[PDB]
Amino acid sequence: LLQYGSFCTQLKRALTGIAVEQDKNTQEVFAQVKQIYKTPPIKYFGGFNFSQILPDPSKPSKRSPIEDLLFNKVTLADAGFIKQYGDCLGDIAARDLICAQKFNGLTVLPPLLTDEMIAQYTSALLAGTITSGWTFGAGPALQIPFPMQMAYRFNGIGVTQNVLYENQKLIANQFNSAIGKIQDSLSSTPSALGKLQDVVNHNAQALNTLVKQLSSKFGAISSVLNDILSRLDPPEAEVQIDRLITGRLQSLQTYVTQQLIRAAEIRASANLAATKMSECVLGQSKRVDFCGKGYHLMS
Amino acid sequence: AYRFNGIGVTQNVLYENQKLIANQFNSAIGKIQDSLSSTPSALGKLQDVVNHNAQALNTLVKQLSSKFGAISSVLNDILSRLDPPEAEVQIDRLITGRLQSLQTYVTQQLIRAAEIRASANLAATKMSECVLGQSKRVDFCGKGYHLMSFPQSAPHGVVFLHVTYVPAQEKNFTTAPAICHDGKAHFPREGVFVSNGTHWFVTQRNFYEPQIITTDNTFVSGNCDVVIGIVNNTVYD
Amino acid sequence: ESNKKFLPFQQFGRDIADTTDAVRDPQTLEILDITPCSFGGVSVITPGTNTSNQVAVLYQGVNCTEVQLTPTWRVYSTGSNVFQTRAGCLIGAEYVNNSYECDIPIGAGICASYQTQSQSIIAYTMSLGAENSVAYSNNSIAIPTNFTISVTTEILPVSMTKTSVDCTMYICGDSTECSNLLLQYGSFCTQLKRALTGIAVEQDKNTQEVFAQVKQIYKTPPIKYFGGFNF
Ligand SMILES: *[C@@H]1O[C@H](CO)[C@@H](O[C@@H]2O[C@H](CO)[C@@H](O)[C@H](O)[C@H]2NC(C)=O)[C@H](O)[C@H]1NC(C)=O
Ligand SMILES: *[C@@H]1O[C@H](CO)[C@@H](O[C@@H]2O[C@H](CO)[C@@H](O)[C@H](O)[C@H]2NC(C)=O)[C@H](O)[C@H]1NC(C)=O
Ligand SMILES: *[C@@H]1O[C@H](CO)[C@@H](O[C@@H]2O[C@H](CO)[C@@H](O)[C@H](O)[C@H]2NC(C)=O)[C@H](O)[C@H]1NC(C)=O
Ligand SMILES: *[C@@H]1O[C@H](CO)[C@@H](O[C@@H]2O[C@H](CO)[C@@H](O)[C@H](O)[C@H]2NC(C)=O)[C@H](O)[C@H]1NC(C)=O
Ligand SMILES: *[C@@H]1O[C@H](CO)[C@@H](O)[C@H](O)[C@H]1NC(C)=O
Ligand SMILES: *[C@@H]1O[C@H](CO)[C@@H](O)[C@H](O)[C@H]1NC(C)=O
Ligand SMILES: *[C@@H]1O[C@H](CO)[C@@H](O)[C@H](O)[C@H]1NC(C)=O
Ligand SMILES: *[C@@H]1O[C@H](CO)[C@@H](O)[C@H](O)[C@H]1NC(C)=O
Ligand SMILES: *[C@@H]1O[C@H](CO)[C@@H](O)[C@H](O)[C@H]1NC(C)=O
Ligand SMILES: *[C@@H]1O[C@H](CO)[C@@H](O)[C@H](O)[C@H]1NC(C)=O
């Protein structure tokens, strides 16, 4: 194999580039603000109930109930943790695909940012947008009562403030009911989070196909190198080894190309998500159907 | 002044602070050259394209010295050392390897071209929306409230200079949603009610400029028994 | 030792990749399981060679207690240089208790840097940002009293280099037999030329679309006075 050029250096370079791009995507999406704001100890906002989205201090992970439901809904195969060689050597007579992948040179790297840091970023964004409105996205954060912010948003969509000030209780009750229905809607629907599951399914399928490809003959007498070496005369074994080498190189190149295309698509999706976070959360948008259906208020 | 009116500030704010604004703009422009020169890795995105192209071409050239399972990497040696019907089995290996290298190079170039096209589309949209007009999209033409932008050309790319307005030196105040007077509720037309401790004024949004509360800058449109947190005072005519 | 229940007529055991993992001893009818010997990947963390020649080593996916090795060199562990992260085992760096901005990424929230403390290599947990807390009240507001004009820069790539390739010169050079042999391999080179030409045209299209918004060439007035603004 040493005399077939530098294909493997190119493969390693492409994989490293994809790995770096993933962390860049996450950082660009989730690190808009550099200040960690905290919610006030007293939770009164004019009758608006935000308990379903604020972090829950009782549980160790400090996640909101909706985030807990979301994390329980999606099933993950490998998290990049230490799938230690000690775990694979345990020989529990139940051989999973992870050990087979690991025994053939295929590994998974952990992301730079943990889930706790992402939760902290989300909590900071929520606290800022609840206590300051849209001021903290353009400079220093300025305090303001929540109903006044809501009236300002109604003025933004083209309705006078007395409409809000004379219907505060009804609006608060409607918002509370709408928030309450979200958890039931998410739980009842079985295929709500299909987009997130598709990525995991695609990655697992690609790795399994790559592992399964090792049992092909590619026109040789056997798919095992040791059998060829032990059964054949040394100058005659190269013509059989070359076929296997070429087939495996072709499989690796196909895998790398597919990974590159999928990475480009994921990068486009991440850019869209970052734009949505900048425009619908840190401000009020007038673009039609960009931050929901209807007249946008907040997100 | 028209741009300040666009971001939500009255014109007299500019007309009474023309010299200060001009000096601030001049200093901000002057600092740009020093900031660009001092930073060594400011223009990394533009250098990455050149580095990638050079590396790809160098790899393609270096690939010509591989044997691909043949007896030599030079065609002349094979032709001069081997019997003519036996030389094809050696030439074919080299041909196939070089074809594979070319195909790999072409695929990589296509993917990079797609990425560059996406970047160029974004740059064209930014040029249309931030330079030829004033944008209200948050964080699209800089950080802060957008005023205007200037383009400059660079090797294989463009540079945008965004000018933005940032508030500073804030102060606390006491506020109320409405003012009660003669059994009637008054709401501000534009701005917010503010109290310094004894009196009540009405001010605008992003700049502190108190005014006497009057029927000229308020509308009544209601009664004084349903608004929560109302404060009663006097309204002049 | 093997816990598998081989049938009396079976002699071998295979896995998904179709390689042997269970065997039966020819002399004593006993089942044995075969596992690969320990292995892993190694990464090197260093500052620039212009700064120092010190390095740190990261063994990926390896528990710190399981470290004739394939690499001849060995980095020997002292009392304090060994650290365990969810990304592997780190040797040659000291874990400090402070937090800074990330300098060299390592793993799950762990970064490394070169610090003067005697200069050394330290490892830490990255800091998200400065702590803050805004006071919230339902009868209080904050209003700015001054402003600042700021100027920022943004860099965007537009186009890249346009290249062309000659198949016959690259693959066969001046040989005629090679060209005759290549002539019967189809029309791959026509496709290659078409793709390269398309990319070359697209580059010029990108530049034209970016830089040709207006069709009138305006000129600045000879007198440069704009109310005190210096351009
Ligand atoms: C905000 O909503 C939550 C959930 O609807 C309320 O929590 C409920 O409180 C009642 C009375 O204390 C309990 O019987 C329920 O079991 C709680 N539900 C959950 C899911 O914990 C909460 O009280 C609301 N906020 C306020 C201020 O009333
Ligand atoms: C709040 O603002 C009002 C309006 O300017 C202040 O009242 C003035 O105070 C000055 C200073 O003594 C007097 O010369 C003026 O005659 C007052 N105005 C009127 C209409 O009488 C008031 O002092 C301010 N309060 C605080 C705490 O600064
Ligand atoms: C708003 O900020 C500007 C700039 O920070 C202030 O202008 C400065 O004022 C001080 C005090 O007179 C001078 O010593 C500086 O030379 C000024 N700077 C410039 C660039 O002119 C301005 O005073 C502030 N506004 C208020 C009302 O205090
Ligand atoms: C606009 O700014 C430039 C640069 O800050 C000014 O040019 C300077 O002018 C002074 C006095 O003529 C010279 O001593 C400097 O050497 C010049 N700097 C450079 C870089 O050439 C220019 O004068 C300013 N415009 C006006 C109208 O004053
Ligand atoms: C406003 O008051 C709060 C609480 O007293 C304080 O934290 C804040 O610094 C004050 N704002 C200014 C601009 O002084
Ligand atoms: C004005 O407000 C005060 C304080 O709440 C209240 O005692 C008084 O009754 C109000 N005036 C009228 C005419 O209701
Ligand atoms: C093979 O020979 C050895 C030594 O003579 C003996 O211990 C063993 O049981 C034999 N095995 C069989 C299968 O005959
Ligand atoms: C590493 O080995 C020690 C030794 O007993 C063990 O306690 C620890 O759980 C191991 N760590 C992992 C991640 O397997
Ligand atoms: C690091 O700081 C934490 C903060 O309380 C402390 O509990 C811990 O003991 C410190 N560790 C060392 C090694 O000093
Ligand atoms: C908000 O208003 C309520 C009135 O129900 C009051 O009890 C509370 O103290 C107010 N918030 C603050 C921060 O004073």
Numbering used by the authors:
A (entry chain B): 753 to 1051
B (entry chain A): 903 to 1139
C (entry chain A): 554 to 620, 628 to 677, 689 to 802
What wording appears in the published article?
The Omicron XBB variant likely originated through the recombination of two BA.2 descendants, BJ.1 and BM.1.1.1 a progeny of BA.2.7516. The recombination breakpoint is located in the receptor-binding domain of spike, and each region of the recombinant spike confers immune evasion and increases fusogenicity. Recently, the XBB variant emerged as a recombinant lineage between the second-generation BA.2 variants BJ.1 (BA.2.10.1.1) and BM.1.1.1 (BA.2.75.3.1.1.1; a descendant of BA.2.75)16. XBB harbors the substitutions R346T, N460K, and F486S, which were convergently acquired during Omicron evolution (the mutations in the non-S region are summarized in Supplementary Fig. 1). XBB.1 is the variant most profoundly resistant to BA.2/5 breakthrough infection sera to date and is more fusogenic than BA.2.75.
S ectodomain was reconstructed as two closed states (closed-1 and closed-2) at resolutions of 2.50 Å and 2.51 Å, respectively. Comparison of closed-1 and closed-2 showed that RBD and SD1 in the S1 subunit rotated at the hinge, and NTD also slightly shifted (bottom). There was no major movement in the overall structure of the S2 subunit in the two closed states. However, some differences were observed in both the S1 and S2 subunits in detail. As a major difference between closed-1 and closed-2, the cryo-EM map around the fusion peptide (residue: 828 to 854) was highly disordered in closed-2 but well observable in closed-1. This suggests that in closed-2, the fusion peptide could not adopt the stable conformation observed in closed-1 due to the movement of the SD1 domain. In closed-1, S383 of the RBD interacted with the main chain of D985 of heptad-repeat 1 (HR-1), but in closed-2, S383 and K386 of the RBD interacted with the side chain of D985 of HR-1. As a difference in interprotomer interactions between closed-1 and closed-2, protomer 1 F375 in closed-1 was located in a hydrophobic pocket formed by neighboring protomer 2 V407, V503, and Y508, and stacking interactions between protomer 1 P373 and protomer 2 H505 were also observed, while F375 in closed-2 was located in a hydrophobic pocket within the same protomer formed by V407 and Y508. The cryo-EM map in closed-1 showed a higher resolution, and the RBD was well packed, while that in closed-2 showed a relatively lower resolution in the RBD than in the whole map, suggesting that the RBD region is mobile. This further suggests that the loop containing F375 is trapped between protomers for packing in closed-1 but is flexible in closed-2.
